[PDB]
């Protein structure tokens, strides 16, 4: 999921690998804006019965 971000990259930097060498922020090559990246959704399903 691409969302807005508040972090400020250096002028020559492109993307971020802060934790575990995983990309989470990518500079837009056109508008020169930084967009956050996050996987959309995943999880389990539980059923409650009496």
């Amino acid at each position: 999921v691409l969302t807005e971000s508040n972090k400020k990259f250096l002028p020559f930097q492109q993307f971020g690998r802060d934790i575990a060498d995983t990309t989470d922020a990518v500079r837009d090559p056109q508008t020169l804006e930084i967009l956050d990246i996050t996987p959309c959704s995943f999880g389990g399903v539980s059923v409650i019965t009496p």
């Binding site: 990259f9 250096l10 020559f12 930097q13 492109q14 993307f15 971020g16 690998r17 802060d18 922020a25």
Partner: peptide, 25 residues
């Protein structure tokens, strides 16, 4: 001649990657 000590000079950015508040080797 006349060799000179270079204490902590000659370090650059190895990659075009943003990292904040993390120690990287």
């Amino acid at each position: 001649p006349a060799y000179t000590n270079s204490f902590t000079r000659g370090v650059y950015y190895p990659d075009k990657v943003f990292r904040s508040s993390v120690l990287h080797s």
